[PDB]
C-alpha cells in the first residue's frame, strides 16, 4: 500500500 | 480455474470499488485512470472465469507497480549496482475477500517478480505494508522478500500514525  | 490478464479501462469502476474497501489510504481518480491506461504503471488483473451473472470477467485481484531508478529509491544504499539501475515499487495489492487463501496472491506477486527479472538493468521488487498486516507480512515473508526498515508513523489514517514496514525482493544479483 503506496502512501497518500 | 483463476486467470491473469493486464487491467483495463473496463476495470475501472471495479478497481477503484477495491481500493476504497479494503484499503485505509484514499487514493485519487488520476491514479486509477493512470493504472487502465498502461503507460507508466505496470499491472496485473486475477479474474474467475467462472463467476456467474456475467461477472465472469470481473476481477477479483491485482497488483500493481512503477518502475523507479535505483538510485532515486529510498533503498538506493541496499543495492548493488551494474545501463541505469531500476526497481519496481508495489503500489497496492489486494485479493477480494471471498477469493483468499488460494495462492492469487502469490501468482500476483510472482507475476511482478517475473516480470522485473526480464529487465536487465532491474535490482528488484520493494513495497510497503501497514504494521500488523499479518496476511500481507507473513505473505512477503514466504516469497523471500526482506524486511529493511521500519518507518515509524508512515500512514496518517483518521488523524493517527501506523507504522509501515518496507519489504524488498533483491533479483539480478543486487
Ligand atoms: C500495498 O498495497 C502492499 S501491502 C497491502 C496488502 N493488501 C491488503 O492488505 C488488502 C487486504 N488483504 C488481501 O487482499 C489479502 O489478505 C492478501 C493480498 C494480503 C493475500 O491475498 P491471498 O489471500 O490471495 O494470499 P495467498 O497467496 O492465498 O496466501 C495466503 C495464506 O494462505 C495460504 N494458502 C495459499 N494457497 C492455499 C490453498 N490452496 N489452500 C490453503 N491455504 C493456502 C498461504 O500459505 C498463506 O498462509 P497464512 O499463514 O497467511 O494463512
Same mark, same amino acid.
Given at each position: 500500500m503506496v502512501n497518500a | 480455474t483463476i486467470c491473469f490478464r493486464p487491467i483495463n479501462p473496463s476495470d475501472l469502476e471495479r478497481? =477503484?470499488?477495491?481500493?476504497?474497501?479494503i484499503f485505509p489510504i484514499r487514493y485519487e481518480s488520476e491514479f486509477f485512470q493512470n493504472v487502465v491506461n498502461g503507460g507508466?504503471?505496470? &499491472?496485473?488483473? $486475477?479474474?474467475?472465469? &467462472?463467476?456467474?451473472?456475467?461477472? &465472469?470477467? =470481473?476481477?477479483?485481484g491485482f497488483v500493481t507497480a512503477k518502475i523507479?531508478? $535505483?538510485? =532515486?529509491? =529510498?533503498?538506493?544504499?541496499?543495492?548493488?549496482?551494474?545501463?541505469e539501475g531500476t526497481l519496481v515499487?508495489?503500489?497496492?495489492?489486494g485479493v477480494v475477500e471471498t477469493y483468499r487463501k488460494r495462492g492469487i496472491a502469490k501468482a500476483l506477486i510472482n507475476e511482478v517478480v517475473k516480470y522485473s527479472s526480464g529487465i536487465p538493468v532491474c535490482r528488484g521488487?520493494?513495497?510497503?505494508?501497514? $504494521?500488523?498486516?499479518?496476511? $500481507?507480512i507473513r505473505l512477503y515473508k514466504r516469497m523471500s522478500f526482506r524486511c529493511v526498515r521500519r518507518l515509524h508513523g508512515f500512514?496518517?489514517?483518521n488523524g493517527q500514525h501506523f507504522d509501515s514496514y518496507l519489504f524488498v525482493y533483491f533479483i539480478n544479483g543486487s
Open positions: - | 478497481l =477503484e470499488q477495491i481500493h476504497r474497501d507508466d504503471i505496470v &499491472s496485473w488483473a $486475477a479474474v474467475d472465469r &467462472s463467476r456467474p451473472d456475467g461477472h &465472469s470477467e =470481473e476481477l477479483i523507479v531508478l $535505483a538510485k =532515486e529509491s =529510498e533503498i538506493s544504499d541496499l543495492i548493488r549496482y551494474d545501463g515499487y508495489i503500489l497496492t495489492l521488487v520493494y513495497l510497503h505494508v501497514i $504494521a500488523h498486516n499479518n496476511p $500481507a500512514y496518517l489514517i
